[PDB]
Design a protein around this nucleic acid. Structure first.
Lengths: 108, 108
DNA sequence: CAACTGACACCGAGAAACC
DNA sequence: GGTTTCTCGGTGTCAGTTG
């Protein structure tokens, strides 16, 4: 249980996702949030985390199921919203720039 | 344990629509399972769920607030974890107008 | 028309509570 | 011990909104 917390911390610390820490206390971080309708949407890099969380919890299986980034994007938002681990800073969410992003926070 | 004899009396009563058998030995029966959408009504669709709460004194009429979600959750959690009831997932028609589930009463 | 969202319902699997 | 319920961290559904 509670695999979402440690998984996301490991994803941010990995740096493999070009989602970064916004402070050095490792308590507030960035996260990309590009809309899948924009002409700047690469289905691979933009939906990389959303696919990974579906691959992690055994929801999407390669070469077996039809890909669907919308469902992958919806599952991660509901997980972050429902989990008592991450509180989103909606007033700091800069969701209207060249590369939109949200801001979250982790508590004890 | 009161779940076995109680449910057998509910199906045999025929008071709830959809709660019927599938053989003459009364060992395989359909249970009406809808999603709370469509023509869902708290009366006819969620009647058996209220009976279990009243039977086990979990809901007093006019005192506790009606909560059909947890009423169906209690009956589900007890029905699934019961060893007197086998869920036949292969005949479980979940993709129809009035979806039902097939349960078998194991003898003992 | 696809994509997105919040509000609400749903779920299984250990962990309790309760015979 | 054996049975019913409670917890919890996810997930699904819908109706309206949005790019």
């Amino acid at each position: 249980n509670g695999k979402l917390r440690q998984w996301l911390i490991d994803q941010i610390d990995s740096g493999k996702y070009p989602l970064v820490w916004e402070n050095e206390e490792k308590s507030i971080f960035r996260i990309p949030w590009k809309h899948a309708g924009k002409q700047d949407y690469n289905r691979e890099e933009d939906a990389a985390l959303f696919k990974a969380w579906a691959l992690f919890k055994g929801k999407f299986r390669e070469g077996i199921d039809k890909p669907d980034p919308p469902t992958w994007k919806r599952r991660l938002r509901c997980a972050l919203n429902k989990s008592n681990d991450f509180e989103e800073l909606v007033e700091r969410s800069q969701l209207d720039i060249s590369d939109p992003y949200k801001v979250y926070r982790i508590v004890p």
